């Protein structure tokens, strides 16, 4: 019974998806996020060996001791919603607010964060899950441990090697082949979203707001960014999907070398 096992606290956020609350598991005081998804807004459904939101299927597939992805601890069905119990880092800030408040991140910080996102996305792909909404809003920073967690699998799909013709993630992080043709492959589209994210980190906002900018193929840098970092970004943002790097190519890129450990990242950049 849901209402017995968790103490609900303050609303943490809401939007199209539904609403999420701070909570604590009564059983042992573990911090949790309690996410309410309305059935009316669930577009994609999966099957547990039960009919659940695809989000629940994807979350279960990526569920593990690896911290890089949010863990689903439990879930419940109600008449008009599903309630998902997610583990909650404490203290936490999402990467959107962190960039808003701090501005453009030092490259050493951006490198540590971006590497950790790469590792988390690799984890998803290797678990057969495509996220489809990689953005700063969907990344939490454990501000004490300096560990990042990918959240929000509500636009995700099972990973496949053929084209996707559906998309409900964030348009400004979506690739030019989606804008032009309503078609993309999963991995190359993920790399584009990663390019947007890296630019966001080192410049303090995303490069593109408009469809014409997304398809235009020009990346103007508004901050001083190293040549090596600009190169990586522009490679991730190649207009031709097959010109974009693999995850291996990204992590082998010279700009990605000598990454900080998460605990060093907290010590140098987060503890204040």
């Amino acid at each position: 019974p849901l209402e017995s096992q968790y103490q609900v606290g303050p609303l943490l956020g809401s939007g199209g998806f539904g609403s999420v609350y701070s909570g604590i598991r009564v059983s042992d005081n573990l911090p949790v996020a309690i996410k309410h998804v309305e059935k009316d807004r669930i577009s994609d459904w999966g099957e547990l060996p039960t009919r659940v939101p695809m989000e629940v299927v994807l979350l279960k597939k990526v569920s593990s001791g690896f911290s890089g992805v949010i863990r689903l601890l439990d879930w419940f069905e109600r008449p008009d919603s599903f309630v998902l119990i997610l583990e909650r880092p404490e203290p936490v800030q999402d990467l959107f607010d962190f960039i808003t408040e701090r501005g453009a991140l030092q490259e050493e910080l951006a490198r540590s964060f971006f590497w950790q996102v790469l590792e988390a996305v690799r984890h998803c792909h290797n678990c057969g899950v495509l996220h489809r909404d990689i953005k700063d809003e969907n990344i939490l920073i454990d501000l004490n441990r300096g560990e990042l967690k990918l959240i929000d699998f509500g636009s995700g799909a099972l990973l496949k090697d053929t084209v996707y013709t559906d998309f409900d993630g964030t348009r400004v992080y979506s690739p030019p082949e989606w804008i032009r043709y309503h078609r993309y492959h999963g991995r190359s589209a993920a790399v584009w979203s990663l390019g947007i994210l890296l630019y966001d980190m080192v410049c303090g906002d995303i490069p593109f707001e408009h469809d014409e900018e997304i398809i235009g193929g020009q990346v103007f840098f508004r901050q001083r960014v190293s040549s090596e970092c600009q190169h990586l970004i522009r490679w991730c943002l190649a207009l031709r999907p097959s010109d974009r790097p693999t995850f291996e190519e990204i992590q082998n890129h010279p700009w990605m070398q000598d990454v900080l450990l998460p605990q060093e990242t907290a010590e140098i950049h987060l503890h204040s």
């Binding site: 939007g15 808003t100 909404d133 809003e137 636009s155 409900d168 964030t170 348009r171 303090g204 906002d205």
Partner: peptide, 10 residues
């Protein structure tokens, strides 16, 4: 001066 905004996932 330039406005940074969240963007809706849909």
């Amino acid at each position: 001066a330039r406005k940074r905004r969240r963007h809706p996932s849909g």
